[PDB]
């Protein structure tokens, strides 16, 4: 069964999210844990967490299909110690928001060394994840591949493995694959040989059960462009044919597809329709 959804707004409450998710034709979703402007975030009230949980039950959303995503402030690779410390403290709080909501997965970008060096930046990330994981329980942190922009770490799957193998609680570190960031970095899912190489690399670096989520994004730019600009499904350089190849892999189907393409609920309902249209047109099983 296809597990698909989108990044959902939380601005009207967490509890609106399950209903909004089924209204766009999804059964999966991603949300931010908060809308804080700075380094401090509130927890949801007991009242709000309870409503969220009730709506999850009401709509039969699978808890393996519900993800949180960290905000853009957190940078565990920062060469500024105070930003590193505030990032750690905020990440811990985001794990506590997840715990409160019942959310099992917290997705993050590993970070940027800002031109101080990839190897030292990886160590900083590792140490930061240790401080976080060693002071929390339950929640699994997802490392997401990113584009090769400035001092971003994680544009090659190899880098995500370097972080993971140094972490204390490796079972609480897993992986998210973003189709747009990968395409930006040369991972060519428009060809079955590219998808096969991607899967072989994932299986060998992490094992396939570490792949917890795919971010389903088309790209504004060509393969290898390193641009980090998402596009609506079928409207970019991955395209309808490219996605049809990607969708044809059973291994890919086992994993929730989360849209982070431009627009709101309305555009995402259309992108979800496009995905089923692509699957129908190209005769993909299932």
Annotated binding site: 69, 109, 144, 178, 181, 215, 228, 230, 260
User: For residue 123, which of 86, 151, 162 has the smallest C-alpha distance?
Assistant: 162
Q: How deeply is 117 buried, as exposed, middle or buried, from its count of CB atoms within 10 A (0-12, 13-18, 19+)?
A: middle
Nearer to Zn ion, 30 or 136 (CB): 30
Nearer to Zn ion, 49 or 232 (CB): 232
136, 104 contact by CB (below 8 A): no
CB count in 10 Å sphere of residue 36:
15
Least distance CB 109 / Zn ion (angstroms):
6
Nearer to Zn ion, 49 or 211 (CB): 211
226, 184 contact by CB (below 8 A): yes
Least distance CB 50 / Zn ion (angstroms):
28
User: For residue 128, which of 156, 95, 155 has the smallest C-alpha distance?
Assistant: 95
Least distance CB 105 / Zn ion (angstroms):
12
Cα–Cα distance measured from residue 226 to residue 194, given in angstroms and rounded to the nearest whole number = 18
Residues that bind Zn ion (CB under 5 A): 144, 178, 215, 228, 260
98, 139 contact by CB (below 8 A): yes
Least distance CB 69 / Zn ion (angstroms):
6
Residues belonging to the binding site for Zn(2+) are: 69, 109, 144, 178, 181, 215, 228, 230, 260
Least distance CB 230 / Zn ion (angstroms):
5
Is the backbone of residue 111 left (phi > 0), alpha (psi -120 to 50) or beta? Answer: left
Nearer to Zn ion, 251 or 260 (CB): 260
Nearer to Zn ion, 144 or 218 (CB): 144
């Amino acid at each position: 069964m296809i597990k698909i959804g989108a990044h959902m707004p939380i601005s009207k409450g967490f509890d609106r999210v399950p209903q909004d998710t089924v209204n766009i034709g999804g059964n999966s979703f991603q949300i931010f844990p908060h809308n804080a402007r700075s380094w401090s975030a509130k927890l949801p009230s007991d009242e709000a967490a309870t409503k969220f949980k009730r709506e999850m039950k009401k709509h039969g959303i699978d808890w393996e299909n519900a993800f949180c995503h960290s905000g853009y402030l957190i940078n565990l690779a920062s060469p500024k110690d105070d930003i590193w410390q505030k990032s750690v403290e905020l990440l811990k709080k985001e794990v506590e928001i997840c715990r409160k909501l019942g959310i099992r997965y917290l997705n993050i970008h590993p970070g940027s060394h800002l031109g101080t060096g990839e190897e030292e930046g990886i160590d900083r990330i590792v140490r930061g994840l240790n401080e976080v994981l060693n002071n929390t329980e339950g929640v699994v942190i997802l490392l997401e591949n990113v584009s090769q922009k400035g001092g971003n770490i994680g544009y090659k799957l190899e880098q995500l493995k370097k972080i993971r193998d140094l972490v204390d609680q490796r079972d609480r570190v897993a992986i998210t694959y973003d189709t747009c960031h990968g395409f930006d970095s040369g991972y060519d899912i428009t060809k079955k040989e590219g998808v096969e190489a991607l899967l072989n690399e994932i299986e060998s670096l992490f094992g396939l059960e570490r792949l917890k989520m795919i971010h389903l994004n088309d790209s504004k730019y060509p393969l290898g462009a390193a641009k980090d600009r998402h596009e609506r499904i079928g409207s970019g350089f991955i395209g309808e044919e490219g996605f049809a190849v990607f969708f044809s892999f059973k291994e890919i189907q086992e994993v929730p597809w989360i849209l982070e393409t431009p627009g709101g609920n309305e555009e995402h309902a259309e992108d979800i329709k496009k995905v089923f249209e692509i699957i129908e047109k190209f005769g993909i099983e299932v």
